[PDB]
């Protein structure tokens, strides 16, 4: 289902970001679970600056279960 904000995102933005979660991680199946991962944080999300924190907050939380 689309929401008001979605229109502000385009899908090369969309795109830029998921492989920016791709870098935060055959080929395809990473690239499909990133897809995954900030496809639910699209719909999931109520605005955009929810949006990049739901990504943000991501790589950080990926970020520290490795460290430990």
Do not use: F, P
Request: aromatic letters at 8%; charged letters at 35%; proline letters at 0%.
């Amino acid at each position: 289902i689309r929401k008001q904000w979605h229109e502000d995102i385009t899908q090369d933005l969309r795109n830029h970001l998921v492989h920016k979660l791709v870098q935060a991680i055959r080929m395809e199946n990473l690239v499909a679970y990133a897809r995954k991962v900030e496809g639910d944080m699209y719909e999931s999300a109520n605005n955009r600056a929810e949006y990049y924190h739901l990504l943000a907050e991501k790589i950080y939380k990926i970020q520290k279960e490795c460290e430990e």
